[PDB]
């Protein structure tokens, strides 16, 4: 029932909606959402390109702004931009009542921009600062350059979604660089209280990349084993006594956040992602029918640390097969950059 989400707030994970369109805000249906539980939004160019083509509001904005000389691209902003700035708004008291750790609505820098890491900084920091909204997060690809961006961007004060994690050492490289900015700030006595950044980490997709081939016993059980690693990985990175020193000056631990969480296999139940995730000072992002398939017959449990022993044992059995993940998640991050400026394209063609 609705008060699941809840009692997943209880067990400390926050559940976001992996959707936004100009509808959902204006209806006041994001606006419900967020007194039954829903505790953010994310956004991502294939969202935008769904939404644009089936919401008929666009169709009196598009039309505005067809008798304005501007490029696609920033047609496409301004629509953007005004739709995650309504739905900050929608937000901002769930945002302002936990002190700035909800509520937030991310918004993707331009693909073409993911292995350039200053033009990546210049773009994000000029969407926030279009939003003008302090819960807007923006939300950059974790390639090498990503992370270079992340640091830049922390130590400017900009809340980030760094996304298409696919790799526990790339997440750990996230970190290290989150880290790097937040110790620039304090250095410069500059504040870092409410400075928030989520670590993405897609999982179905994983899933649909290896289950074919895997033998019985391991299909369907790949990416939960790397998300429970990776949330290991996690206990011991913010732990451990450096960043301890920091978070004791007002530093926010980076949080873990599942996206890609819809189920794709039609033989796996369709809350197995949310169901097997739940855990401490997380985040789950879920498109909209698996947020309804979770309330109706989704289960609350703590289960993202039960049985870490076993998906170990998975692991060194996905490496005894020879599969390397670090070249899987290489491999899924560029293909989810490819998928995702695809879907850029075709949604800036109808606003040229």
């Known amino acids: 029932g609705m008060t699941i989400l809840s009692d997943v707030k209880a067990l400390g994970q926050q559940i976001w909606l992996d959707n936004l ?14 007194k039954q539980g829903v505790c953010g939004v994310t956004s991502n160019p294939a969202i935008f390109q769904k939404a644009f083509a089936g919401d008929a509001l666009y169709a009196d904005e598009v039309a505005a702004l067809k008798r304005q000389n501007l490029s696609p691209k920033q047609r496409y902003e301004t629509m953007a931009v005004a739709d995650v700035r309504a739905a900050c708004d929608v937000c901002l008291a769930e945002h302002e009542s936990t002190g700035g750790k909800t509520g937030f609505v ?41 992370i270079d961006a992340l640091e830049t961007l922390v130590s400017d004060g900009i809340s980030v979604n760094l996304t298409l994690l696919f790799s526990r050492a790339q997440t750990l490289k996230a970190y290290a660089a989150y880290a790097r900015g937040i110790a620039k700030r304090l250095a410069a006595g500059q504040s870092v209280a409410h400075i928030q ?23 369907g059980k790949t990416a939960i084993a790397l ?5 290991q990985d996690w206990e011991q990175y913010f732990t451990a006594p450096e960043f301890a020193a920091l978070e004791a000056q007002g530093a926010n631990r980076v949080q873990l956040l599942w996206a890609s969480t819809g189920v794709k296999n ?10 097997s995730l739940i855990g401490v000072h997380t985040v789950n992002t879920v498109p909209d029918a698996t947020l309804k398939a979770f309330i109706d017959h989704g289960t609350a449990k703590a289960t993202l640390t039960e049985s870490a022993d076993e998906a170990r044992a998975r692991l060194a059995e996905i490496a005894a097969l020879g599969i390397d993940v670090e070249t899987l998640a290489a491999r899924l991050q560029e293909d989810g950059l490819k998928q995702f400026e695809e879907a850029f394209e075709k949604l800036l063609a109808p606003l040229v």
């Open 21 to 34: 369109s100009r509808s959902l805000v204006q209806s006041g249906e994001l606006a419900q959402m967020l």
């Open 106 to 146: 991310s918004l993707e820098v331009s693909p073409e921009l993911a292995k350039d890491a200053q033009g990546t900084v210049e773009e994000a920091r000029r969407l926030h600062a279009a939003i003008a909204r302090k819960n807007a997060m923006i939300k950059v690809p974790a390639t090498d350059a990503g």
């Open 197 to 219: 950044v989520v670590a993405s980490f897609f999982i179905s997709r994983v899933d649909s990349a290896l289950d074919a081939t895997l033998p019985d016993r391991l299909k």
């Open 227 to 231: 998300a429970k690693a990776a949330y």
């Open 266 to 275: 039609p033989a796996y139940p369709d809350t197995l992602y949310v169901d």
